Structure formats: C-alpha cells, structure tokens
Point group: C3
Chain length 147, copies 3
C-alpha cells in the first residue's frame, strides 16, 4: 500500500475539512445572531465580515489541497504537512480576526500566504527535480550529435 507515504497529507487534509466545517457553522451562528435568513448574504458589518471570512477561506481551500499533495508527493511529505498545519492555523486566526474587525484579519492573512507560497515553492522544486535531469540529458544527447 501507499497509505504510509501519504497519511500525514491525509490527516492535514481532514483537519482542513474540519476547519472549513467549523467556519460554516460559525456563519450559520452569525445568521442567527444578526438575524439574516437565506438567501441574501448582506446584513450588519459583523455578519458580512464572518460571511466574507468563510467565503475567502472556501475559495483558497482547493489551492491549499492541490499544493499540499503535490509538495508532499514530489518534495517531502513532512515539510508539506508542516506548512499545511501552519497554513491552517493561520487561516483559523484569519477567520477569528476578520470576525472581530477587517483590520485584524490582516496579520494571519499574511501568515497564511507565506505558508501557501512555501508549499508552492516546494511543489515547484519537486517538479523541477523530477523533469529537469531527463530534459538536460535529452538536450546534451541531441547536441552530441555531432559524432
């Protein structure tokens, strides 16, 4: 089985799902507190901030998953998982901040982006490591060629 090579990625993934669920329930709770009934996603500022925090997190969640898995498979499982943990924690802080004030969402936002780009960089390096040698070899061989 290849379960062993991906269990941490799977665990972080599940943690991310749980965190998103948490955000969703928080939005339903703001819908009750500030009396906003579906459909319609406009209301008091505090509701709009909670709603909006949830929407942004939802929009970024697939980016996180894709890169987490690519980085974890092509670069290193543990590093990718760590960045994922930091990312998710950063996102929890983003949601809480935004819920209190637009400005307080900002620090954890930046933290979440650094973690996410790190995941990207690891994904990119891992892919580069996979493709670049064969390509260079093929290029040298074609030059060779001469002969």
């Amino acid at each position: 089985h290849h379960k062993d090579e991906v269990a941490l990625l799977a665990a972080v993934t599940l943690l991310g799902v749980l965190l998103q669920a948490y955000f969703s329930l928080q939005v339903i709770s703001a819908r009750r507190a500030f009396r906003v009934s579906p459909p319609l996603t406009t209301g008091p500022p505090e509701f709009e901030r909670v709603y909006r925090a949830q929407v942004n997190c939802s929009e970024y969640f697939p980016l996180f998953l894709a890169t987490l898995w690519v980085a974890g498979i092509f670069f290193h499982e543990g590093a990718a998982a760590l960045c994922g943990l930091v990312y998710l924690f950063a996102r929890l802080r983003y949601f809480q901040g935004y819920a209190r004030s637009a400005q307080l969402r900002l620090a954890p936002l930046y933290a979440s982006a650094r973690a996410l780009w790190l995941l990207v960089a690891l994904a990119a390096l891992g892919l580069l490591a996979h493709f670049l040698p064969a390509a260079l070899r093929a290029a040298l061989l074609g030059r060779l060629r001469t002969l």
Copy 2:
C-alpha cells in the same frame, strides 16, 4: 496499477462533477428566465435561490472530494462511495428544493450533512487506525525503560 483500489471513488467523483455542471447550467437558465445578465448576482427571489443553491453546493464540493478520497483510501472504498452517492443525491434534492422555496431546501440539506459527517467519521477512524498503534507502541517502549 492502483486503479482497481480507487475506481469507485473516481466514478463518484465524476458523478459529482457532472452534478455541479448541471447546477451551473440551471443557473444560466435562471439567468435567462428571470432576465439577469452578468456580472450582478441579484434579482428576483427565485433567481437568488437558484444562484445561492449553486454557490453552496460549489462551496461544499471540495469538502466532499477530500473526505471521500481519504475515507475511501484509509477506511473502505465501497462504504465511502456509498456515502458519496447518498451525499450527492441529497445535494441534488437540496438544489431542487431551494429552487422551489428556501424552506424545501432544508430536509435534503440535513441529509447531505449526515452523509458528509459520516464520511468524516470514516476518514477519522481510518486515520486513527493507521497512526494509533505505532504511537502506543512507541509510548510503551519508552516506558520500558525502566530496564
């Protein structure tokens, strides 16, 4: 190949994609019926309900995929696929209900959430089964130690 261990997950996944596509085309059709042109996502209640049904389904679709795959790999492929089928059916009913009335979206919504949490629980149990024995052993060994 590991295709055999994941083909049902892949089939349910594809079914989910198809269902989302269906939702999208239904939104374009409500855009024509109630005369709402892009951008701008406000209009009559019925349009806002169709739009909103589609948006919620879209937001939950990655949660579904992640857990489906984790549950299917770490717990049991068939069970995970079944829950996925129920989930997707529940989501189809959610979209149809919401399209008719906000209140009629509610029963299939609850059905979709139960299926989704079941997927989560299976994912969680499977991950627990993978990590917990090695951890307990390591802990016992460290205690041993004495000696």
Copy 3:
C-alpha cells in the same frame, strides 16, 4: 514510485494554482484602483467584472482538478494534461476578457467549457473501460446458467 505516472498532472495542477493566485492578486489590484475595501464586493462595473471573473474561475477550479486527475489516471496522462493546458489558457483569456468587457469573456469561456467536457468525456470513457468488461462477463456468466 508512481510519481512518473502523474508528474504531468501534478505540473498542470501547480500551473492552475499559480493562475488562480494570479487572479487573486488581480482582484486585490482592482480593489485598490477602484477604491473598494473589504468586506463588500460591490463597486464600479469594472471591479465587479474582475471580482466576478475570479469567483467563476475559483468555482470551476475543483471541477477541473477532479476531472484532470480521473482522466489522466483512467484514460491517458498526456491527453488529459493537454486538455488541462488548453483549459487553463482559455481561463486566462476568460479572466482578461471579462476584465475588459462582459461580452469579451464569452469566446474564451466557450473554449474553456469544450476543454473541460473533453476531460469529462475522457474520464467517462476511461471509467467505462475499467468497469464494463467485468460487468458484461458477469452478466453472460449469469445467463450461462442455463447449463
């Protein structure tokens, strides 16, 4: 390792992540240019068009990933990757068009949908190829039976 069987899918995936990130930064830039501060996602038409382009791309991005991977695993890795590249290029053109005018988003939109349905069709054929023979055999055997 099975890295070799999926590296192109992973590369296209990473490219898609990068493209989404690009869209996000473009939205932040329209937020500055046309003075729209979070929360609140209403403003001048040009902002609403950029915002909306980003939202639609985000909503379709998981559909793309799912089908890309299924098609790439069950049908053919290279074909799936190609369709993915075309899709993503089409999406870049969609975002740029929409940013200039609602009508100019339309041609690349259609291009993106054709590529996406092609991915779907490849996913479907690959799954059909996997499941249909065993099913037919089982059915013939049950007929046999007689005897």
